[model samples]
Structure formats: structure tokens, C-alpha cells
Target chain A: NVAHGLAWSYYIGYLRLILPELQARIRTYNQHYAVSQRLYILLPLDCGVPDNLSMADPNIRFLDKLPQQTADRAGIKDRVYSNSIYELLENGQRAGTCVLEYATPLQTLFAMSQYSQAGFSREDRLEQAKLFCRTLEDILADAPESQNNCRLIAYQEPASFSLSQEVLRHLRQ
Target chain B: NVAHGLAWSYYIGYLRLILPELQARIRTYNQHYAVSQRLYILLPLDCGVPDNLSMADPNIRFLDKLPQQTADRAGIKDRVYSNSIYELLENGQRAGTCVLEYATPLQTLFAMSQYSQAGFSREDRLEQAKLFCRTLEDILADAPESQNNCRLIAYQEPASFSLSQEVLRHLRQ
Candidate 1:
């Protein structure tokens, strides 16, 4: 019941370590561009929004919407394609927009572990999440710049330990 | 403002990783004692309670409480001692209680970091946290069993990395 009461498991454990990176990224964006220019950042494909969106001020947005019928059927909220977005504004006018997308292949699979009560297996979820993370890393390394701009720029480095065997071991134990 | 929003930083990042341990410990306790006995597991000192007390049920209690006058003056809410306590009940009575304490010297110091606006330096906070963690570990190892029953049994190993230099580096950056 209640999907084992687990959701956003990856974030639950990693937000403290990850927040500095996020803050730094935002600071970098602010430093690198004018208030009128937009800066986008991509998050992991958790298919959910950060808990503290208000901290980012008025311009942040997570772009996703699911149709009511689809959401009802899947027991998920409807949302748009973009994972998250933040924009810069000038005089209440849109200056630039930064779009965050869940561009990684493993986001869904890694996210499945969070829904343990939904009949998804944890072992498989971890396996797929790791595979997905690896694939995402490879794509980031070799993919052309034409892919999602925020994806290309925001997550340049591979995560220190995302869906690693060690993590699985700990979770399983 | 709002304690610099740093409340529970350690737990938020470490809880997922630490939960399995907590669960295992609870299991250990259940195996060791009867359902009518109580097992309590305490956390390292962080100077606060879970934001929602009811989620843990009425019996779940954080054992620390500041004086009403002091809390009122500091704009802190009152709570009772032991950083956190979880108790299992059989029928209407507590079977066992597990009390977790913030026994480390850094408990208060590291906690002070959370109130960045409260005039404590990050450098000092980090330093004191490490010191406290180290001192706690030593006491846990060599101290006699008569000190605190739960403390003697619950923490068997030194935490992998508690308030280390790397943590300071990331925090500073």
C-alpha cells in the first residue's frame, strides 16, 4: 500500500550532498549571465519536482503536465515534458529561459525503486538505474551540443555514486 | 531567516543511507527482546525533533526539551530529551523502546551550523562536529557498559565518515 511509502528515494538520501552542487550551479548561472539571460538546469529523471521550489524565487518552473485520464489510470500526476526550468526576468518581462529536462534513459528505471509498493522489483530497479546512469554519462561525453542545452551543461560530471552496487548492497541489506 | 533553512541537513542527506541501519537495529532489538520490551535508538545530537511528531505515533518521543522561557526567547519550540526515540508497542503498552542520542561532542556544535545567522562560524562548527564525533566514537568503544544501555549496544562501529575534512570542503565551497 502507498507504494511502500517510498518516493523519490534517490533524492531522500542525496539531497544534502546534491544541494551544494545545485546552489553552485545557480550561482554560476547568475555569475555567468545577465539578469535578462536565462539559465537552465536538468535534474535526474525522478518525474517529480523538488520539495523546496520557493527557495529559487519566482522564476523557477518544472514543466510537465499529464492528462487527467492518464494520470488517474497510472496513479501519477500529469505534467509536461521538461523536468524543471528556471527563467531570468527584467521588469516583469521574460528575458531568458533555462529548461531542465529528464534527458537520461535511466531516470524512469532508477525511479522505479521508489515505487516498491507498485509491484516493481528493487533488484531490477537498481540494475536498470545503474545501466541508465552509465548510458546517460556516455551520452553526455560524446553527444553533440544539439541535444538539450541544460542537459549538456548542467550535468557535466557523472554523479559520485548514483545507483552503484554499493548503494544497492546497502539498500538490500 | 528561518535558521538559514539548515535544519536536519545531516539527517536529510544521511537518513536514506542510515535507514537500513536503523531498520536492522530495530530488527536486532526485536530479536533480542520481547515485543513487550522497548528498544530506543538515539541520533547524534542535532538539537531538534522531527517536524511532525504524530507521524511516529503518539508513543514516539524525542527525549530532549528546552526550557519554555529559553525556547520562547530563541524562537525555538519546546520538546522533551534524547535526540529521538522510537518505541514498539504490543497491544496498548510499549513492548520495547529504542533510544537514540546525539552523544557526540559535535552534536551541539555541528547543529549550530544550521543557524548560520546565529553568529556561529562554519569553520568552527565543522571543527567541533568532527571533534565531537571522534570523542563519541572513542567513548563508545572503551566506555563501560553502565553508561547508557542503548548507547552501549546500538553503535558498534565508527561511522564511515562523520564531519570529516571533505565535508568541510564541500560546505565551504
Candidate 2:
């Protein structure tokens, strides 16, 4: 569905009123860097090339593009992740990077499983993952269907109103 | 430009929002009514027709199917007496014949001038006479550059914005 990408773009394009902080954050840096460079300014957790799937990753490169299936062992790595809960905050307090910075206890044990340690208990991570996934599912469920989901995801703020509701109401008697 | 009539249709199309009492007051319902009736509820105005002089004194007419000379004279007569407005609205209003029973102040004045006085100016008829003359001036002022001393007239209340303004704010970024 490309919902996540679509949503982020839609938010940047139309719902600036709701995601003003995000808008300002992106625009503030746009004067100095291109969009691609600015995106990595916040999240710098780049997983290594397939040959070197070590705990320590570099800048967060996977979020910008999808990885190829041929790189997955036994033809199993078809799926590529764009965003991760661990990188939610941009260049903030956490000078966190790969290996040295495995997912947080909450992130590894709960939300994002991609960075979970190999020896980490699968059952614990799986169970907590559902809680995080369900909250996001409900949000996407309530959002307008017409918006591009991916862009919306990238740009959506927890504090935003439903744009469709306001526009529809404005046109009403 | 032919935009006058096309523009009129658009603005009148949007007025169901501002004036549902339109049928009672303007005796000019709207072309959008029938299109919305099947939806089981009245549709609110969509800002279809811009509010301005162009619509009020449109240059194009469905009745232009007639001869040029005939069409021009008929148009002048129609505008002077509010017949064109009535004709367009009636086509879009209630079944068989439009049920709207009132007239705009100018139309009311025209009616009084026709039935109440015989060039007598009784009942302060001079005011009504002046309104008709002024309306005539507006219609002529909107004519092509070839028409000497002619320029568009100012539209009354609810219309301080010009066509250029409408194009800028509504049609373009």
C-alpha cells in the first residue's frame, strides 16, 4: 500500500497545521542540507552490509531504502524495514550507534525487534511487540483513507486532528 | 468573456450554504439543487459560482441559440427584468414550474414601475426608475472595448472581491 511513505508526504504537503513541530524541524535543516542528508541527521543506526551483520551498525541507512531479497540467507530476507521505533527520536541525547547500542530494553523487549540481540528471549520480545503494533494499527485505522499512508506515517504527529473532519465540517450547513 | 455566464453558474452553485432562504427571497434557487436532491439531503454550497458582477450580468445565455440581434435584445430585456435569473433558477428548481414566489428588490421595483404607475413616479417610483437605469448602465458597461465610455460596474454587498482576486486566491496558489 505504500501507506507509510504516502502518509509522510501527505502530512508534509497538507497537514502542516497538525505536525508543525515536524514541519519546522525538517524546514529548519532544509536550508543547509538536502532532504536525504537531513533524514539521517536524526537516526544514525545503519546496519552493516549482509556479510557483516554485526551488532555495531553505522548510520541508519536502511530507513531510506529497501534491501534486496538476494541478500537474505536461504531466500528468507525479502522484507526490508523503513522505520524503527528505536530511531524515533532524532539527533537527541542518545549519541547511540549500532552494536554498542542494541535496542533499548523497552525497544528490544517490546516495540522494534529488528535490533533485538540474537540471544534475546524471542517470546518476551514477541509478546511486547503486539502491544506496540496494536497502538500503531489503531492509529492507522482511524486516519483518513485518502491520504498517502507512508507520508502520513512519516509526518503524522500524535497531537493532530483529522483533516478530513475539519474540511468536511467547513463545507457543511 | 464567456466566463461571465460560466462563472455565474459556479457561484450560484455554492450559495445554498449562505442562504437557504434563497428560494423565498431571491426567487432564484440554484442549479445544484436537483443534482443534490437524489442524495436525500440538501447539499451545502461548494463555492461553485464566484460572487461578482460577471455572474450578475453574464454575457452568455443558453437562449443564445436564437439570432444574434434577437439574442442581444432578449438578453438586455432579460437582465433588466430579472427574467434570465428566473429562467436559470426555474430550470434548476421545483418540478414543472419554480415555486419561488418573491423577487429581488430591483425586480420588485421593476414590477411596481410596470404595474403601479404610468410614468407618474407615484409611490416614490423615481428610486425604482433609477435602479433600472443603473442596472442598464451596468449591463452596457460590461460590453467590449468597442463600446465607448463603457466599463464594468461595482457589484453590491457580498462582492467586494474582484474576478482577479478570485483567480488569485481561489484558482491559483
Candidate 3:
């Protein structure tokens, strides 16, 4: 029984490697514009411009790599390396409160939907989920959190964590 | 710092909701059908038959919904609802000693990749996560935990759960 309770907490140690490794430092490039939120660079899309508006035609416009902010009240910087947007969404944007139902690609799509200028139709989002799963399964196979050698944040300001080790520890158990 | 940390947890929670619903339940199913892990009911295909493939199609055959007896002995009976084939794989699946991650859908996807046919594929998993969110957002917008609630299980036989009224209150906090 004791072991069962502790089981969940133990895996937390194993998950750290996939935490956040963008190596793209959240530099406060725009001091005046930058409040405390740390800005991470968003990679641009490769989709050709959508022509002739069809309901099935893609509605999302490319941001050409916008610098999106994650942390609030904390201007930050980091040089992330060898990371994908999925990981950013998983560990960075989603942070620690990730639910267990969805996958990272799905999360990214939803995040893109949120960030998209026209937002997203429910149908399009579902279609995108199906398409991405079909096309990109092989390429992204290796970044499994159980296998990655991810880096940990050296100095995150206190008071950011919602669940404490003790509390999260019980959830693990 | 305070705001970013809070935002991070919130987003991750959103992401987590997109993953498989039950990890322990799926693993039990996988182990029970070790000889046919491919037939493990959690396959990402649709509930019934695939349109592209016929019944005679080798790659597209029906996988009978896993029965409750096999699932319970395998530890998944708790996950199924009545005769419904909708075993909530949205959260985590129990794998070896890594039961913690299996509690949520994101974690379950992580677990499935490890236990299922090819293990978890990154892009595919992420794509599934996105799909899960979009689908749920479409069908069950602002659904309460009672609807999509992830109940923490107790470890003992004839398993019983004991949460501090204070602790339960805190979990909501």
C-alpha cells in the first residue's frame, strides 16, 4: 500500500529530462514591451498561403515565428537546444498542470488554434489532429519523456509551483 | 513569477486533458492480451470498422472490445463504463513501477507507447493529444470533473480511497 502511494511520485524523477530543453533563452529583447513574462520564440510554419476561401481550406495564418511569452511577472532568458514545439507545449506552455488525455501534437494544435487569428472551427481542429497523427508519427518517436536526457531549470522564482512535492507526491502514490 | 507559474500549470492541465483517460486500465488489458497486444482495445482506430479496410483486410480487422473479467484481472475493469467500449484512456496507464504518469490522459499516452505495439510515437501521441482536446471540446465543452473526473485510486485489494476533507479541498485549490 505504501509503495502504491509512492509509485506516482517516483516517476516524477524520471520525467524531468523532458521538462524543457528549447535552449532558446527567453531573453527580454523588448524591455519596454516585456513585462515579467518570459518570451520564447515560436517557430514559423511551412504551409503555403491559403487561396480561394473554402471551408476546408486552412484558416490559420502563419506567425513567421512569433516570440510568445510563457512566464508572467518574470522576464527571463534561456538558450534552448534540440527541442521541438511539442515539448515546449508539454513542459513549457502546459507547464506542470498537463492533463493525461491529450498528446503533445494535439496540444500544439489547440495552442495554435488559440493563437490563430481566426481561431479554429471544431471540425478543422479534429481534422488537423487526424492529419498530424498520420503524417508525423515516425519523425517524433524518439523524444519520449521516459528516454530523453532533458535539462532542468536552474532558477525559477519561488511561488510559481501550484502543487507541492508533498502534495504531488501523494498523487504519485 | 507568480503569474507565469500559474499559467504554466493551467496550460499543462489543458494539454493533459487531451491524453488517454486510464493508464492502469489499459496496461491490465495489454498484459492480459500479451499474445495479441495489437488487439489491445486501446488502439487509436475508430470504435467500429475502418472505412478504407474491409473485414477481410489484414491490417483492418475488428478488435473485440476487451471484456471486463480479463480487464479486471489485468486491472482495467475499473476503467470501463458498463458495456461501453469507451474505456477512458485519456489519462495515464500503469506501467511497471511508473503508475503516477498513468493517472492522466497525457501520461496514459506515454504509457501506451511503452506497452503497446510500437510503444509511444511522439508526433502521433501529440497529434492524438490535440485530437482528444478538440473532440472533447466539441462534445463536452466546460465539462466538470464529475464528467471527465480523474479519481485517484486506492492501492489495496477491495480498494478503498481516503482523502482528507482538507486534502480534497486542497486538490481543488
Candidate 4:
């Protein structure tokens, strides 16, 4: 229960800190020039395989359908369904966001394949994730506060990032 | 006449050296992973704006209606008019490429804004060219022979890199 609460807390904290600034960046970029408004935040779910699958904790169960239904209502399809959020930044130039649902490690592979047609195998997906992390790190290198918050999250929940250490490595690197 | 011949010779030599390796890299990346298949190579045309802007270079005059008529015959709209090639990697899961036509520096901005909906300014465009150079450098780093070829091209024609020094910096970096 303690771990569950902490995980949820960290997720919420990350969203709170990053989303506003991300939105602001998109907005500013929009006024100056057009930038890709197609932003995605991959949400990893801890639900396991059917019988062995751990159920969503009682606290965050309500969130499972919130973004999904919202994006659906707006006539946007959820590109991936592992357990991700896809929505537009409120002030983005395009005003659309896609939350990819990656429930298992395999789901990330599926999403990447469909999204980019890169047809990455499992190992390839891991490498791509690492590359993406490096790019994100480069973008955030000037923002020490933001980097530190990410570091804290990665430190507090190392196990949560088992499959996506590329992003986590940036927090420390 | 000698200088013109030399320039043509240098261009051909650069293309001959880089094209096969570039093609090979794309094929290999395609086989293993899903990377963005939307590739573009900017064609810098040195046609001055006329009293009436009839977009055609005397050197490439016969090429004017080739792609346009082809896409038209196929019932596909020409997305951007900056002279560039767009196509998918040979082995990519996705199959299509787009070329953007950039006659002037302004055309690059227009193409970027339309393609990604990210409006970029002259400065932003320059910066992006630099970024692209950095990426290209990284890709060629492990292959010293390839890197040297690029350096030779940049050195032989300094005017060719007046707009983008980022890639040239990589030759030595």
C-alpha cells in the first residue's frame, strides 16, 4: 500500500510539474512558429498477466478510463492501448494529445511499430526508448530543477523504470 | 569554365561517396527498428527571383513538371514545393517518402510549418539545420572514411555550408 501510494504520488507530481511547462512551451513555440503539437506521454500500467495480473490499486482505479473516454469523446483514437494517456495540450498549436497505453513491455513494441512503422523488435524498442531519453535530456539540460525532479522520481521508484531506463538514466547522467 | 567543371565534379563525387552509405544505413535501420521514414534532402537551387517568379532553374529546367505531373497523374496533391525528395527507407515497414522543395531560405520555413505545423523562423531554421548536422555527424562518427568524405566536401566548397556550419563542425569535432 505504501508503494502504491508513493507511485501514484510520483506520477501525479510528474504530470503537474511537466504538463504546465510543456503546454507553455508549445504555446510559445506556436506564436513564434509552428512546432509539432503531437505530444505524447506514455503511461505505464502495472497490471500483470490475467491470473497473475495485479489489479489496479483502489486509489487510482478511477483514472483508468478518464483520459481514454475523454479522447474518445473528441473523436481521437487511442493509438496504443497498453495503458497510456493521449490528449492534446490545451494550448498547443494543434490542440491534440495522444496518451499511449502500454500495459506490458510488449505493448511498447506494438505502439512503436504502429506509430512509426519502424517495426522494432523488443531490443530495438529498448534502444529507441534510450534514444528518446537522450533527446529529452538534451532538451532539459538547461533546466536543472526539472531534471532534479525527474531524478527524484527515478530514485524513489527504480523498479518502476525497469523497462524504460533510458529516460531514467538522464535523471542521473 | 574550369571552376564550373570543378564544382560539378565535386558535387558528383560527394553524392557518389555518400549516397550508397546513406542508403545502406537506412536499410539497416529499417530492418531492425521503426524510425521515422519521412526522409528529406534539401536541394538548394540558385535561381534568382525574377521580375515574375516563374520557378525554374535553367540547369534543371526540364525537371520542372516531372514530379508535379506524376503526382497529378496519380491524383496525389503535391504537399510542399521546396525541391526535396520524400520516400520511405527501402526496408522500412512504412512505404512512402516526401521531398520538400526549398528554393529560398524562406521555403524551408514554409515547409517546416506546413509539414509539422511547427512555425519556425529564419533563426530557428538555422538552428535546426545545425541540429540535423549534429545528428548526421553522430551517425557517421563510427565510420571514419565516411566522415572524411563529408569533411572533404565541406572543405572544397565552403560556400555550400554558409547556411549550415553545424555539420561541418562535426568533421573536426
Each prediction's whole-model lDDT (CA)? 0.30, 0.23, 0.26, 0.27
Chain A TM per prediction = 0.31, 0.28, 0.23, 0.28
Better of 1 and 2 by TM-score: 1
Q: What is candidate 3's CAPRI-style docking category based on DockQ?
A: incorrect
Q: lDDT by residue for model 3 over B32-122, one digit each (tens)?
A: 7521111111112111112222121222222323333211111011112211121111124211111111112334344444433333354
lDDT per residue as tens, model 2, A31-50: 54323211111111121112
Instruction: Give one digit per residue, the lDDT tens place, for model 1 in A38-89.
Output: 1122333332323334232344333221111111100011211112333434
Q: Report the lDDT of model 1 for residue B94.
A: 47
Task: Kindly give the stretch of ten consecutive residues in candidate 1 chain B with the minimal lDDT sum.
Answer: B67-76
- lDDT digits (tens) for residues B101-163 of candidate 2: 111223223232343211223344444334433433443344232123212122223524332
Task: Tell me the DockQ of each model, to 2 decimals.
Answer: 0.01, 0.00, 0.01, 0.02
Better of 2 and 4 by DockQ: 4
Q: What is the interface RMSD of candidate 2, in Å?
A: 34.1
Candidate 2: where are CA atoms >4 Å away?
A: A1-19, A36-56, A59-105, A108-122, A141-173, B1-173
Scanning candidate 2 chain B in windows of ten residues, the lowest lDDT window is: B35-44
What TM-score does candidate 1 reach?
A: 0.22
Alpha carbon lDDT at B49, candidate 2: 20
| Cα lDDT of model 4 by residue, B1-173, tens digit | 11121122122222223333543454554565332222222322221112111132211111111111111100111111112222222223323322212212223322333322122333354443343333334444544445433332111123423312322233223
2 or 4: which has the higher lDDT?
Answer: 4
